[PDB]
């Protein structure tokens, strides 16, 4: 089984630099690409970095270019965050993820398969496609439908498949696949959760809802760089009321 964990948060000033570490094990780490996403302390989860296996293509998100550098050590399965002129947005969780490829008959698709635990970062006192989900928050009866939406700014489709995914949270968990290419069951994943829709418009359904579904749920698009996500919708469960004979 594959594990990621990651190292070297703290509290620091602002202005100052810090280094972050991930070991990675249970698989080939060489073969794969990588990326650092962070979540803030209002939930909201953002790509930070990308790189190759070989460190030959790198991506990093607008809000930190020049000031944070992604690099690896492929002999020693490691991975790391280099961090300068540290300000206050950039307080959060940060987790490592793994580009993992899912073969299939037209093309291999590659997702954020495996995450980390996380490590946690607080400094102290002093045309990206744009992906709109609703609602915020609901509360669903025993057995009955969670039903979530997300419109995409432009659309999301490569000449016949649409690059959404789906992830579901729980708290002290990093984010779980639970669908990809818009409606393709994640392996594992339950058919009580589907998904639907193409070009702008997408959508989530669980039914019949159970007691562990209790979760935030996100949507995210892998068709352009930068990986962008929604703003999250929390799932709270309904008790009904108990029969009679």
């Known amino acids: 089984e594959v594990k990621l964990v990651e190292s070297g948060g703290g509290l620091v000033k602002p202005g100052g630099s810090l280094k972050l570490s991930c070991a990675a094990s249970?698989?080939?780490?060489?073969?794969?690409?990588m990326h650092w996403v962070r979540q803030t302390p209002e939930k909201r989860l953002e790509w930070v970095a990308y790189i190759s296996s070989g460190s030959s293509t790198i991506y990093y998100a607008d809000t930190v270019k020049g000031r944070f550098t992604i690099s690896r050590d492929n002999a020693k399965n490691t991975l790391y965050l280099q961090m300068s002129s540290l300000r206050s947005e950039d307080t959060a969780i940060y987790y490592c993820?793994?580009?993992?490829?899912?073969?299939?008959?037209?093309?291999?698709?590659?997702?954020?398969?495996?995450w980390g635990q996380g490590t946690t970062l607080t400094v102290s006192s002093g045309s990206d496609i744009v992906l709109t989900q609703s609602p915020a928050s609901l509360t669903v009866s025993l057995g009955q439908r969670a039903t979530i939406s997300c419109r995409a700014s432009?659309?999301?489709?490569?000449?016949?498949?649409?690059?959404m995914n789906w992830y579901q949270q729980k708290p002290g968990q990093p984010p779980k696949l639970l669908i990809y290419?818009?409606?393709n069951q994640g392996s594992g994943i339950p058919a009580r959760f589907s998904g639907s829709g193409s070009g702008t418009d997408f959508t989530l359904n669980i039914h019949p809802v159970e007691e562990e579904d209790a979760a935030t749920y996100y949507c995210?698009?892998?068709?352009?760089?930068?990986?962008?996500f929604g703003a999250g919708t929390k799932l709270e469960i309904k008790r009904a009321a108990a029969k009679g004979e």
């Open positions: 290419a818009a409606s």
């Open positions: 995210q698009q892998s068709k352009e760089v930068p990986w962008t």
């Open positions: 249970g698989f080939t780490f060489s073969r794969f690409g």
């Open positions: 432009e659309s999301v489709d490569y000449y016949g498949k649409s690059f």
């Open positions: 993820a793994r580009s993992g490829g899912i073969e299939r008959y037209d093309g291999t698709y590659y997702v954020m398969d495996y």
